[PDB]
Design a protein around this nucleic acid. Sequence first.
DNA 1: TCGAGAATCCCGGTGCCGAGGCCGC
DNA 2: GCGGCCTCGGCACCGGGATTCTCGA
Lengths: 75, 99, 302, 305
Amino acid sequence: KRKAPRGFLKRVFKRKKPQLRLEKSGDLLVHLNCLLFVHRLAEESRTNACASKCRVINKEHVLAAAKVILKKSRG
Amino acid sequence: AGLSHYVKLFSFYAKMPMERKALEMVEKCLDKYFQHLCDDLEVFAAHAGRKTVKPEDLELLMRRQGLVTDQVSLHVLVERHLPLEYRQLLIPCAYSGNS
Amino acid sequence: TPLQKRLESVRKQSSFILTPPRRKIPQCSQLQEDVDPQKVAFLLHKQWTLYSLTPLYKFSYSNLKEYSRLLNAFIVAEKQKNIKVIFSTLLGMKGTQRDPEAFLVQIVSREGKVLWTGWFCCVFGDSLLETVSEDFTCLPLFLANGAESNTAIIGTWFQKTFDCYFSPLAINAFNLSWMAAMWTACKMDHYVATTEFLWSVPCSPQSLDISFAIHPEDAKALWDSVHKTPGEVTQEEVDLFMDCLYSHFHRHFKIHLSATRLVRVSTSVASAHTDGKIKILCHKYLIGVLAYLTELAIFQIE
Amino acid sequence: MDETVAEFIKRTILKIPMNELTTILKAWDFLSENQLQTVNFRQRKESVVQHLIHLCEEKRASISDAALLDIIYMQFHQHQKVWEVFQMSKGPGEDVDLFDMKQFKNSFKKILQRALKNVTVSFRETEENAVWIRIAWGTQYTKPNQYKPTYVVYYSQTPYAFTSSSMLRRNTPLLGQALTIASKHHQIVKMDLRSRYLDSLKAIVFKQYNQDSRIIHENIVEKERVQRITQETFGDYPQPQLEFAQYKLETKFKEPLRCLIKFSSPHLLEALKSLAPAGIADAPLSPLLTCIPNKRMNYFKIRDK
DNA sequence: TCGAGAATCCCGGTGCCGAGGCCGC
DNA sequence: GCGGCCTCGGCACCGGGATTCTCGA
């Protein structure tokens, strides 16, 4: 996949928090943040899959991935 | 939509088949990711004293996420993942008219 | 001379003029020159799946690194459709000085987990050298052992770059009985394994297999019963050894083993199958076992 | 829901194929009727092997019933893990008036944990009246190993007690010993019948298997004869031995000439039956080869006589 | 003479590629 | 009920257990 939605990230940044002034390409920075967050998710979930030696990512690996990376990606 | 964009990009980022039931939970992970981010941009932009969220307002946040370092600055991180027509907006090129 | 010699060879072979190859008992082949003891010893007790390899056009034993890269970049690309390829000249797997030096093709995966370990050898194969031009470095034998998938990929690469073609060498039960006889005729000591002959009867509904495994010293004493002329084993001597097996099996179980076909003849020298997964090389007679195997590969090529 | 138990259940649940998932999961009783609907058995292998084991995480699965799962898996896959046949022998006297399945379970577990103190013996009294013992071994120095268990199919009051020939360790003389002391016998003997098809070993050791006008065939008087002699040695519906029916010959060639014959067929006694009519074999087909079920033996050790 | 150590015969317990099944056009 | 998809499983090659048989208590 070679895309990054201009409209969706702006709509999310406005829906979730109504009071900001995200800059001209600040939503592009938000997309980069989510791209790298999902990078960390993919790689550490691959690590989680190798932890239980499961050849398919499942729910029990993603929930363990979340509490590590999502907490780590908190500012 | 965009969450569906990221779960599809997860497929080409995990390099490995997963389950749809995994994807709606990673959807809640992205929702909480924004539920931490947009108020982390909130508090970081308030820390700078500026109403708007300038690019350096997020460079500090990504320093917090450990992805910006003295070795890996903000702009280099744009090289590795964003497409050219998108990083043309972010990292200043030069025409004697640097963006 | 450059082709017409091969045409006359084809004429001689197709003529089938009194074939019975009275063969010299495989002589103890003291390991010639280098023959890397670690490499050769690693190459002995590995179940080589034989193939017949036509001569390689425009091959050189100097450009091993270039072929190594060209094939490594092709194998991992067949995964796109972690792996290292080490072409390694063996320097001693040759019968006469004029034979092409045998060279390896190893799919080395991190550590030295050799996945595939190909092997092209041309020993005592001077029935092909004197008929092919200089540009071709002919190695009739190809030895797989890696998965059939990787063999059917390196074979395609070799076809693409060298115009060499891999027919899977199938040792017929006649040649199998021959080698089963000259390997119990050898002068070895401390027999590693029993002399087993895996027969396979031709029943249409069922597929019963027989493992006529003889004590290796007991088969040597049975061979001496039918061995009269020394130095060379004849077709009649081989047939009498095989018929003494037949008359010790039909004697016992009243089923004519001669009505069945050999599928595998395990011997202390070298195991040998039919369907291709043939040559285990237990002892260091491999320059003689490989001599027979290359002579058989000429039969398929020529 | 434990070490070497939850993942053991996982390793025995990916073993069982997708078709008979209901069949084996219904019989081992941890998943009641209500629990079957929760997991969609038809979706995926890793999905079911993850949701089912969770359904035991809530059910706090223990090795006592995890081993029963393996038993029920093998009851439909007994055609693997080639089986030895043990034959008990009481001396002179009355039979075992007390084979109480409770008492036999006690008299087997007690004797086995007397020496092999760490073993997980799990019985399953089948409906064909044949206790299906499964033994996970391990010495006092180690935990009971469920990786390579030794299932023992002891027919309840029968002198014959099949055994999964897993490794043939020092427990095999204790496997026979505990078997012959739990059931009130005195001598345990390996019958040396070793076949992969327990449903055929059951037949053998119990003797339960037999109970154109233009084409002028000149050797018709011989084809009729060979068909006759292959019908008085192989009567009807032979059972598939499918086993390496060894004949460790020690005979002189006509001092001895050692041989280790191994007939190997997916269906042996039928392959021999179609030998003589196919011209491979003589009509009287060497009772060594016909009397495999008649002697209840295939791992022969013949000599000269 | 006998008791522990190593090697190796006998057969697993594992690895891994064709066969059968199965879901869009 | 087929198209590119996928999953069991026979065959087979490589890894420890007990029998040989050599050496120490």
